[PDB]
Symmetry: C3
Subunit: 217 residues, 3 copies
């Protein structure tokens, strides 16, 4: 039988994942989303230009709804008692590497359009796998998105990249009937993200991916 000891990166996640579920009791909701109009919005932007990914695109909406449900992007402090809510909506997106997991953070989302968000993610990925991500480039996420939905899955119950308060679960696009669906999932600090507040968000995010001719306004 072969062993090892906890190495560099694998060390960071060991201690941050223990912390994560050590401290924050998790609650998770899932919602079906008609990503049909979605798809053809991506299959149109792939032709007439370049880029956008399912991931990137979902990162363009996510802030604007964090804006609306304020409690969803805070972090939890040293101090039991307090919270620091956040008003600079910028996201992290977890990538697989060789050495381990990662979460580069694309700064103030709600100001880089969709194309950009999605080249940002690649520059930060194709480097993530080289692990040449300057330590600047991994801080200050108000909130995080995780997509297995490239590698597979249909539904996940993620662990909240601490010390954020929420994270979002992206997945494989599945073909039931004749319209393309994808389940999303949200896990969040149920010390503060209550019954409704939880859902009420995912349902709203749902509500947009499910009518993007709107996003325009």
């Amino acid at each position: 039988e072969e062993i090892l000891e906890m190495h560099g990166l694998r060390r960071i996640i060991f201690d941050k994942m223990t912390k994560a579920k050590q401290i924050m009791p998790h609650f998770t909701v899932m919602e079906e989303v008609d990503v049909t109009s979605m798809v053809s919005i991506l299959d149109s932007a792939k032709a007439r230009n370049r880029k956008v990914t399912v991931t990137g695109f979902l990162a363009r909406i996510v802030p604007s709804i964090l804006k609306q449900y304020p409690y969803l992007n805070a972090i939890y402090d040293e101090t039991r008692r307090v919270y620091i809510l956040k008003k600079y909506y910028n996201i992290g997106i977890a990538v697989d590497t060789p050495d381990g997991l990662n979460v580069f953070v694309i700064k103030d989302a709600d100001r880089k359009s969709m194309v950009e968000i999605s080249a940002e993610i690649s520059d930060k990925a194709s480097r993530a796998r080289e692990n040449k991500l300057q330590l600047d480039e991994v801080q200050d996420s108000t909130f995080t998105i995780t997509n297995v939905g490239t590698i597979g899955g249909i539904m996940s119950t993620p662990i909240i990249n601490y010390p954020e308060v929420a994270i979002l679960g992206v997945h494989r696009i599945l073909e039931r009937e004749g319209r393309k669906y994808m389940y999303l999932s949200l896990s969040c600090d149920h010390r503060l993200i209550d019954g409704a507040v939880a859902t009420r968000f995912i349902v709203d995010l749902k509500k947009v991916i499910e009518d993007p001719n709107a996003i325009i306004y």
Copy 2:
């Protein structure tokens, strides 16, 4: 540019008691799918003359029934480790949203109460709950808890049992398929008292009823 926001009356009460919730009770939570077709037209008819009732208050009536079949799930955790205390009355925690936070109220002795007596209650217990007029009377010895979010959204959640009880039951949005109307159900519980198996055997033995309410007359 940030915002402090500590906590208040309730927030702080929920904080500690969610901390305390999922700190001791390890969580198995399972989901079955229910052909709630035959339940919906039950209700949708009672609108056309019977005044009520509600998806919840309906589940609430059957729920106790099925508890008496598997005692372990209507059981409260305790003080010292080493102690179990299952109860044999039935008061069901059913928890609405407020602007203040998550409130939870218990329909005392639901096993004696009527589909309507239940539902015509949850209403006057929750119109209050948001406008914050709810007596201590209305909030103590719960035996188990049900939590409808599908009046809002979602297909399935991973809800967290209300302490110190031992199981909980999530309800979520109702969707068409064939189109018969299904919706997913979920119940989470303590994996010390409720071995995985027997919880499943609870929701199916619930699932079954929701799919044969004719046969609720037993």
Copy 3:
């Protein structure tokens, strides 16, 4: 009104209390799930319920899973109590979850990679039927490198299972469905989200979908 009743604790009950308390105490849990075209499997079972009793879903599954624990070695491990340790295991000894009157028991198909479909399915009843009668021996309940829990012999679409501590991964079997015009079923995974990352976890079950997905090829 009302009247409660204080119900104490026991050998096996209290050992479940423990394994469980201490399961989620330190295994911070992740869950993921895919859906399988179990339609091409399920029918295989059906040709062989006719001529060669028996073979199950649990049987079928048990005998594929290790060959997929081979590809990703990271989930076939114990979790160590000099804290920071590995014990990535390299032999496969698959666990099983089963309801016995007294409480949840587990047992192990010693060396799964060496046993054919039937033999394991023989062994499972020859142990469940004996855990039920509470006559199951100390060397049979040990050494599990990984465990499967089936509930869809009673129900469930999908559940978040709890690892048999101190293993490191668990796979959760469910009922089949009949979507249209196909027979699907949800599988589930739960693993220590440290010694097992984000992707990997799914990347795993997906390759396990893959070889339920086309059994026709699993002659070799």
